[PDB]
Ligand binder design. Structure first.
Ligand SMILES: [Zn+2]
Lengths: 222, 138, 150, 208
RNA sequence: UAGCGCCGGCCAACUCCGUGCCAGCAGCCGCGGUAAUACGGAGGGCGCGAGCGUUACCCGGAUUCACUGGGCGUAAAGGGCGUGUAGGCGGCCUGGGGCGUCCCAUGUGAAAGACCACGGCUCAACCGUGGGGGAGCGUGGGAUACGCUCAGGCUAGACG
RNA sequence: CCUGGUCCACCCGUGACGCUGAGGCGCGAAAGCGUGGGGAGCAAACCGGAUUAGAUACCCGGGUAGUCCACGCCCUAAACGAUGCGCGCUAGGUCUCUGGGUCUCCUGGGGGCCGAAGCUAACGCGUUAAGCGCGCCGCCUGGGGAGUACGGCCGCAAGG
């Protein structure tokens, strides 16, 4: 799929906190705010989306990451739609470098889910009960989407690259491709497949991700 | 005051690539042009053209780089890895033909200036001449 | 396959109240004598344990070394902040000429003839590290043509 | 004092069999057979990792001790091997194998190297017609290294050649048992040597 | 005929006994106050061999006087500041000269030595014979980018 | 009132007239030296008071030189950014003094903080470089002994 000239939604976000390297993606300043040149965002989308089709039909896995408060309720949604994994609540340092050590945390969920169905529930100390009840509680937060990761992902779809420069760092080191919805404040020089655009705006995050996923699905043929 | 023209040139080029510029302006001159003729000719740079910079004649040297790297920090292998005036003013170093230096097991080059023209090591040695050894680039 | 080669192990110290709790440090070099050398620096509470770790680090990040008939395709001086190392290719027969450290690293690079020279601070660690960046910079007459393309 | 003392003590220190006695260093006993541990009270002890010099050292020694030459001459050879064009290592070995004494060994006129020297210093060796008692004599290619007319009827040499019916001679050498002669065809090549050494380690050694 | 040094690290070579911050070793770090691979003997071991050690001295390691190839915020190191003398160094275009500078030819650069090769004395040390190389300077011829110089022109430095 | 530096705008005028800078000459905090004037406050030394094991101090009360002025000498310093001068080159953000502009923004010079590339032993530095570079001067080359000794130069002396 392709997009329209939907310009009533992305056309810049941040004030004057920008990163000089982003210049290549700005139109001009208006009322002290940078405005992204959309004619250019179209040139980038037409490539990034290419990458995803490639990935998708090749049957790949894209980890969706966005710890921003605004994208919270969106990230959850979209990933769930492919079969994609995602990082909603908070991004754990090493969910990719130290994966084998974290995937261990995953098994801890697996093993607890089990106990809370089996007969060994109320039967045994209750102090531990609470103690164990809380552990799932926390897991069913952070790991909620990571769970789907059988092995490290073929690409990451990050939202605020500068906020998730930890995730990006990691990936960058493990040679996993980076796809992010970036703008004024990011270092484009580190994002394999950029998507220059506003993002605090639900209206922006929502569009950028939906059109991506629709790409994802139509790619596999559903 | 500008004391050494060529060094300022070379040095404008180094200082650029490091920050990865598409091109770099530089005051022009019937020599700085001849040196630049080589850099392009060898392949260290795309090229250069005369440009009018505020009434003043300049040289737009078109920088060249390597591909985008993988893993972290994809700052491209530099094409012009190293570059430095050998001969400086107040220390001009001239060389005999038998004395022209091999650079980087022959991989880099050496730009001289002979009574026969601004040359490379290879060309110089071919011509059987030598002179003011301008700089080492590799 | 890969051959381990310990460069050096030091016992480093800390300070707690009452004791000076110690720690060990190991520098290992790895390689296949073909031309891919690793290099780790493992710290651990016990020595066997240190090396057992250093070994880990090394095998993870090697360096494909160009090898033109045993020697190196071109000299390269390499400042590592404080230490400086000099690699200069030699002819068949002169054999490796370095010290305890660079030797070790080149040896597994499968280098066979070569002229070195250490300069500045001679710190096993840094010199070692230098020697790597050093090898990482080597380029073939191929690799240069391919770079100065148009 | 060109050595001369306990021999299979070295067969032992190096861990590699050193053919220093010919017969016997083939019978269950060059000592390495059944007793590979080095000499001394400490033979049976665990050996700590050999420092770079250490390895370079013993590898030099293994070579030297093989031909049994005094370091003084060994060094000199290496020195002159470096002035020649070629591979500083293979060229070494070349000269080494060019020694009158050594040749007599390869030609088979002697049980071992040691025995070969004596054969020369007692004058049982002709060379292009004239005898020679100086082992350090370097045999050029195309030389007729023979045996003393006088010495042909020897209880030793005689029993040796009898053994040569069955053994092949170094590819770079020829010999006419029926006439107790033999020639030096050319400087043998490294790919033509069997030594258990590592030249590179010997060269490395001399750059300290 | 076989000897001499060494066996804590550097540095190849480890045990017993004597001793007990003594006697002594020791290039440097250090060793020795009753468990000494560091003192003294011994067995044993390593190294070298009519030699081995020692002291002295030269170069080296020492890019630790740094031409090659160093430095100066706090490690030793910016002059208390300015003024300007001698000196060093100096922008763009054009031409002449061609001093520096580069190329060529030529004379010189004795011999011995070093180097390569062939040979001589049973080898080698030693020696002979032949070949090749060279910086520097003389003379002649040439080149003119760059430095220098003279000339003419510019305005981006400076100054008004 | 007399006088130096400097910045901006216009781009008008000269036409490279430039940078550095051994020795030299000038400037050079505080204290201190000569002659004279002056002397409120403060205050070395000195006079007493208290504190203390003691107090030749820290605290309290006095107090002379001095500290203020003129002319002259002295010339040192954590005389510090502990960072020589001059030119070019290499993301920005922000605060501030100051000039021009079409002045919710552009543009010049200066002072601060944060910070890219890069540098750095690290701390840190970072278009006010400790970055990439060229010119020129100054200086360092283990600690102590010593800024001493000797010698010379300077000064009235203290001394430098
Ligand atoms: Zn034997």
């Amino acid at each position: 799929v392709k997009e329209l000239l939907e310009a009533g939604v992305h056309f810049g976000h941040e004030r004057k906190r920008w990163n000089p390297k982003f210049a290549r993606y700005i139109y001009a300043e208006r009322n002290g705010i940078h405005i992204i040149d959309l004619q250019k965002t179209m040139e980038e989308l037409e490539r990034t989306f290419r990458f995803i089709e490639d990935l998708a039909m090749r049957g790949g896995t894209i980890l969706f990451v966005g710890t921003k408060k605004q994208a919270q309720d969106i990230v959850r949604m979209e990933a769930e739609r492919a079969g994609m994994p995602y990082v909603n609540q908070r991004w754990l340092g090493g969910m990719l470098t130290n994966f084998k050590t974290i995937s261990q945390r995953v098994h801890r969920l697996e093993e607890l889910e089990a106990l809370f169905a089996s007969p060994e529930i109320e039967e045994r100390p209750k102090k531990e009960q609470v103690r164990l009840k809380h552990e799932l509680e926390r897991l069913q937060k952070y790991l909620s989407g990571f769970r789907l990761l059988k092995r490290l992902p073929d690409a990451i779809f990050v939202v605020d690259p500068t906020k998730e420069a930890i995730a990006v760092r990691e990936a960058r080191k493990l040679f996993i491709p980076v796809i992010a919805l970036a703008d004024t404040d990011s270092d484009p020089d580190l994002v394999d497949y950029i998507i220059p655009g506003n993002d605090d705006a639900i209206r922006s995050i929502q569009l950028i991700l939906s059109r991506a996923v629709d790409l994802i699905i139509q790619a596999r043929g559903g | 005051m500008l004391t050494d023209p060529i060094a300022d040139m070379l040095t404008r080029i180094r200082n650029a690539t490091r920050v990865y510029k598409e091109s770099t302006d530089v005051p022009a001159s019937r020599f700085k042009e001849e040196i630049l003729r080589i850099l392009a000719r060898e392949g260290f740079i795309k090229g250069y053209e005369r440009v009018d910079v505020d009434g003043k004649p300049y040289l737009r040297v078109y920088l060249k780089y390597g591909p985008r790297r993988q893993g972290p920090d994809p700052r491209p292998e530099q094409v012009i890895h190293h570059i430095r005036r050998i001969s400086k003013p107040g220390r001009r170093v001239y060389v005999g033909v038998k004395e022209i230096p091999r650079v980087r097991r022959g991989l880099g080059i050496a730009i001289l200036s002979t009574s026969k023209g601004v040359l490379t090591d290879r060309e110089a040695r071919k011509l059987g001449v030598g002179g003011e050894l301008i700089c080492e680039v590799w | 396959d890969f051959e381990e080669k310990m460069i050096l192990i030091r016992r480093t110290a800390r300070m707690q109240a009452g004791g000076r709790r110690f720690r060990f440090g190991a520098l290992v070099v790895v390689g296949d004598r073909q031309g891919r050398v690793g290099l780790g620096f493992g710290k651990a509470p016990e020595v066997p344990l240190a090396v057992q770790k250093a070994g880990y680090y090394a095998r993870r990040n090697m360096v494909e070394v160009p090898l033109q008939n045993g020697t190196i395709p071109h000299e390269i001086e390499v400042e590592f902040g404080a230490s400086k190392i000099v690699l200069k290719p030699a002819a068949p027969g002169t054999g490796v000429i370095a010290g305890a450290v660079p030797r070790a690293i080149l040896e597994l690079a499968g280098v066979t003839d070569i002229l070195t020279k250490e300069l500045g601070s001679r710190n096993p660690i840094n010199i070692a590290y230098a020697t790597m960046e050093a090898l990482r910079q080597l380029r073939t007459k191929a690799d240069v043509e391919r770079l100065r393309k148009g | 004092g060109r050595y001369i003392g306990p021999v299979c003590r070295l067969c032992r220190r190096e861990g590699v069999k050193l053919y220093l006695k010919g017969e016997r260093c083939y019978s269950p006993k060059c000592a390495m057979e059944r007793r590979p541990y080095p000499p001394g009270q400490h033979g049976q002890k665990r050996a700590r990792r050999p420092s770079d010099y250490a390895v370079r050292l013993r590898e030099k020694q293994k070579l030297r001790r093989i031909y049994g030459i005094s370091e003084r001459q060994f060094r000199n050879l290496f020195e002159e091997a470096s002035k020649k064009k070629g591979v500083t290592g293979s060229v070494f070995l070349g000269l080494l194998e060019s020694r009158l004494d050594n040749v007599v060994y390869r030609l088979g006129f002697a049980v071992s190297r040691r025995q070969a020297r004596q054969l020369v210093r007692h004058g049982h060796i002709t060379v292009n017609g004239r005898r020679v008692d100086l082992p350090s004599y370097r045999v050029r290619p195309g030389d007729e290294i023979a045996v003393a007319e006088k010495s042909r009827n020897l209880e030793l040499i005689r029993q040796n050649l009898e053994a040569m019916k069955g053994r092949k001679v170094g590819p770079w050498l020829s010999l006419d048992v029926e006439g107790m002669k033999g020639k030096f065809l050319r400087l043998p090549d490294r790919e033509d040597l069997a030594l258990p050494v590592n030249e590179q380690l010997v060269i490395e050694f001399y750059s300290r």
